[PDB]
Design a protein around this motif. Structure first.
Motif, mmCIF file in Angstrom:
data_model
loop_
_atom_site.group_PDB
_atom_site.id
_atom_site.type_symbol
_atom_site.label_atom_id
_atom_site.label_comp_id
_atom_site.label_asym_id
_atom_site.label_seq_id
_atom_site.Cartn_x
_atom_site.Cartn_y
_atom_site.Cartn_z
ATOM 1 N N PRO A 7 38.582 -23.686 6.128
ATOM 2 C CA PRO A 7 39.213 -22.982 5.005
ATOM 3 C C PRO A 7 38.233 -22.133 4.217
ATOM 4 C CG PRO A 7 39.687 -25.344 4.952
ATOM 5 C CD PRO A 7 38.547 -25.137 5.903
ATOM 6 N N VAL A 8 37.024 -22.055 4.725
ATOM 7 C CA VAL A 8 35.964 -21.282 4.088
ATOM 8 C C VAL A 8 36.043 -19.812 4.481
ATOM 9 C CG1 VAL A 8 33.490 -21.103 3.669
ATOM 10 C CG2 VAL A 8 34.498 -23.325 4.226
ATOM 11 N N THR A 9 35.996 -18.935 3.483
ATOM 12 C CA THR A 9 36.055 -17.499 3.723
ATOM 13 C C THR A 9 35.135 -16.751 2.768
ATOM 14 O OG1 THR A 9 37.977 -17.241 2.247
ATOM 15 C CG2 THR A 9 38.419 -17.566 4.600
ATOM 16 N N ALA A 10 34.463 -15.729 3.281
ATOM 17 C CA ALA A 10 33.553 -14.935 2.472
ATOM 18 C C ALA A 10 34.318 -13.929 1.622
ATOM 19 C CB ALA A 10 32.541 -14.224 3.356
ATOM 20 N N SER A 11 33.623 -13.317 0.672
ATOM 21 C CA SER A 11 34.242 -12.334 -0.211
ATOM 22 C C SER A 11 33.234 -11.271 -0.633
ATOM 23 C CB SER A 11 34.824 -13.024 -1.444
ATOM 24 O OG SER A 11 35.439 -12.087 -2.314
ATOM 25 N N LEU A 12 33.736 -10.131 -1.094
ATOM 26 C CA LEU A 12 32.875 -9.040 -1.525
ATOM 27 C C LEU A 12 32.711 -9.049 -3.038
ATOM 28 C CD1 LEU A 12 31.266 -6.760 -0.279
ATOM 29 C CD2 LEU A 12 33.184 -5.230 -0.767
ATOM 30 N N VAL A 13 31.475 -9.236 -3.485
ATOM 31 C CA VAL A 13 31.173 -9.269 -4.909
ATOM 32 C C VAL A 13 30.904 -7.868 -5.447
ATOM 33 C CG1 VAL A 13 28.804 -9.821 -4.277
ATOM 34 C CG2 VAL A 13 29.548 -10.090 -6.657
ATOM 35 N N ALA A 14 31.254 -7.649 -6.712
ATOM 36 C CA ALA A 14 31.059 -6.353 -7.355
ATOM 37 C C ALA A 14 29.638 -5.839 -7.149
ATOM 38 C CB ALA A 14 31.378 -6.448 -8.838
ATOM 39 N N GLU A 15 29.489 -4.517 -7.162
ATOM 40 C CA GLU A 15 28.185 -3.892 -6.972
ATOM 41 C C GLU A 15 27.323 -4.030 -8.222
ATOM 42 O OE1 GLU A 15 30.282 0.176 -6.608
ATOM 43 O OE2 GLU A 15 28.399 0.652 -7.637
ATOM 44 N N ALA A 16 27.969 -4.089 -9.381
ATOM 45 C CA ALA A 16 27.259 -4.221 -10.647
ATOM 46 C C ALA A 16 26.965 -5.683 -10.966
ATOM 47 C CB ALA A 16 28.063 -3.587 -11.770
ATOM 48 N N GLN A 17 27.453 -6.580 -10.113
ATOM 49 C CA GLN A 17 27.246 -8.010 -10.307
ATOM 50 C C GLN A 17 26.453 -8.605 -9.149
ATOM 51 O OE1 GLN A 17 28.892 -9.923 -13.467
ATOM 52 N NE2 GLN A 17 27.710 -8.014 -13.464
ATOM 53 N N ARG A 18 26.393 -7.873 -8.043
ATOM 54 C CA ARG A 18 25.664 -8.331 -6.868
ATOM 55 C C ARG A 18 24.162 -8.291 -7.129
ATOM 56 N NH1 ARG A 18 26.491 -4.329 -1.949
ATOM 57 N NH2 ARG A 18 24.604 -5.398 -1.203
ATOM 58 N N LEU A 19 23.765 -7.503 -8.121
ATOM 59 C CA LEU A 19 22.360 -7.373 -8.481
ATOM 60 C C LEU A 19 21.826 -8.687 -9.044
ATOM 61 C CD1 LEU A 19 22.352 -7.180 -11.823
ATOM 62 C CD2 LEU A 19 23.391 -4.971 -11.283
ATOM 63 N N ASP A 20 22.725 -9.494 -9.598
ATOM 64 C CA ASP A 20 22.349 -10.784 -10.166
ATOM 65 C C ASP A 20 22.960 -11.920 -9.355
ATOM 66 O OD1 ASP A 20 21.023 -11.875 -12.842
ATOM 67 O OD2 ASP A 20 22.793 -13.113 -12.445
ATOM 68 N N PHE A 21 23.944 -11.576 -8.533
ATOM 69 C CA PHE A 21 24.630 -12.551 -7.694
ATOM 70 C C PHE A 21 23.670 -13.147 -6.669
ATOM 71 C CE2 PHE A 21 27.873 -14.248 -4.863
ATOM 72 C CZ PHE A 21 28.876 -14.601 -5.744
ATOM 73 N N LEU A 22 22.832 -12.292 -6.091
ATOM 74 C CA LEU A 22 21.863 -12.724 -5.089
ATOM 75 C C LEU A 22 20.861 -13.718 -5.684
ATOM 76 C CD1 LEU A 22 19.956 -12.875 -2.741
ATOM 77 C CD2 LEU A 22 22.026 -11.596 -2.161
ATOM 78 N N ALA A 116 16.904 -27.968 0.785
ATOM 79 C CA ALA A 116 17.930 -27.539 -0.156
ATOM 80 C C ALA A 116 18.574 -26.235 0.298
ATOM 81 C CB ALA A 116 17.337 -27.381 -1.548
ATOM 82 N N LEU A 117 17.739 -25.253 0.634
ATOM 83 C CA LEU A 117 18.232 -23.960 1.090
ATOM 84 C C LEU A 117 18.886 -24.100 2.460
ATOM 85 C CD1 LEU A 117 15.711 -24.416 2.625
ATOM 86 C CD2 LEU A 117 16.749 -22.330 3.550
ATOM 87 N N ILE A 118 18.590 -25.209 3.130
ATOM 88 C CA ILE A 118 19.142 -25.478 4.450
ATOM 89 C C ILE A 118 20.660 -25.582 4.380
ATOM 90 C CG2 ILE A 118 19.463 -27.342 6.129
ATOM 91 C CD1 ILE A 118 17.099 -25.517 6.710
ATOM 92 N N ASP A 119 21.153 -26.057 3.243
ATOM 93 C CA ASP A 119 22.584 -26.202 3.029
ATOM 94 C C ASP A 119 23.310 -24.889 3.294
ATOM 95 O OD1 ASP A 119 22.220 -28.948 1.423
ATOM 96 O OD2 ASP A 119 24.368 -28.501 1.539
ATOM 97 N N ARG A 120 22.762 -23.802 2.760
ATOM 98 C CA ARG A 120 23.357 -22.481 2.926
ATOM 99 C C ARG A 120 23.509 -22.131 4.403
ATOM 100 N NH1 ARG A 120 22.211 -24.994 -1.486
ATOM 101 N NH2 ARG A 120 22.030 -23.724 -3.388
ATOM 102 N N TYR A 121 22.519 -22.515 5.202
ATOM 103 C CA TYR A 121 22.544 -22.241 6.633
ATOM 104 C C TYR A 121 23.750 -22.902 7.292
ATOM 105 C CZ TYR A 121 20.820 -21.542 11.397
ATOM 106 O OH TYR A 121 20.681 -21.159 12.712
ATOM 107 N N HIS A 122 23.910 -24.200 7.051
ATOM 108 C CA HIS A 122 25.018 -24.956 7.625
ATOM 109 C C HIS A 122 26.362 -24.474 7.084
ATOM 110 C CE1 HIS A 122 22.795 -28.339 9.660
ATOM 111 N NE2 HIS A 122 21.833 -27.789 8.943
ATOM 112 N N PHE A 123 26.370 -24.030 5.832
ATOM 113 C CA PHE A 123 27.595 -23.549 5.204
ATOM 114 C C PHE A 123 28.101 -22.280 5.883
ATOM 115 C CE2 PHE A 123 26.377 -25.849 1.105
ATOM 116 C CZ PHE A 123 27.318 -26.840 1.312
ATOM 117 N N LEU A 124 27.224 -21.292 6.013
ATOM 118 C CA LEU A 124 27.583 -20.025 6.641
ATOM 119 C C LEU A 124 27.853 -20.207 8.131
ATOM 120 C CD1 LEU A 124 27.894 -16.955 6.750
ATOM 121 C CD2 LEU A 124 25.413 -16.807 7.038
ATOM 122 N N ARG A 125 26.988 -20.969 8.793
ATOM 123 C CA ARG A 125 27.124 -21.227 10.224
ATOM 124 C C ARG A 125 28.550 -21.644 10.582
ATOM 125 N NH1 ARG A 125 23.144 -25.047 13.949
ATOM 126 N NH2 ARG A 125 24.260 -24.761 15.933
#
Length: 142
Positions: A7-22, A116-125
């Motif tokens: 049920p996981v799906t990606a999304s597009l974040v605003a360009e003026a918010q992606r500067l801090d989103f990352l 800790a950052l490993i979580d992101r890998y398994h999440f996206l994978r």
């Protein structure tokens, strides 16, 4: 929730918010340490890969991924597994960001943050499996 896909799906974040989103999802310091790491692997998968706009995507799994801006057939030959196949900037951006995650974790040596950052890998994978090109994506990172 489901018995097959996620049920996981990606999304597009605003360009003026992606500067801090990352720096907000990855870290105010990693924002550069990671953005450059994903593209670093990308320019390696393709010999004729100048660059592109790795749009920032938000994942409900608890992480996030970046995908270059290239419309068409991107001849991306992954040396990681020698899988030669043309993919889209999206289906390819998956392998670009993923490989970066596995590098930062092992780049900071054996530390509490190396898991800790490993979580992101398994999440996206897992999200890559929900993609129509999952076959190419998972094999590309395999």
């Amino acid at each position: 929730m489901n018995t097959e896909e996620q049920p996981v799906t990606a999304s597009l974040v605003a360009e003026a918010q992606r500067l801090d989103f990352l720096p907000t999802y990855f870290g105010p310091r990693l924002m550069m340490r990671g953005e450059a790491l994903v593209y670093a692997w990308m320019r390696r998968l393709c010999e004729r890969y100048n660059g592109a706009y790795w749009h920032y995507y938000a994942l409900s799994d608890g992480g996030f991924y970046m995908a270059p801006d290239l419309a068409g057939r991107l001849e991306i030959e992954v040396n990681g597994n020698g899988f030669r196949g043309e993919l889209s900037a999206d289906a390819a951006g998956i392998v670009a960001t993923l490989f970066a995650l596995g590098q930062l974790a092992a780049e900071i040596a054996d530390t509490d943050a190396a898991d800790a950052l490993i979580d992101r890998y398994h999440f996206l994978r897992g999200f890559a499996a929900g993609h129509p090109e999952a076959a190419a994506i998972y094999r590309a990172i395999d």
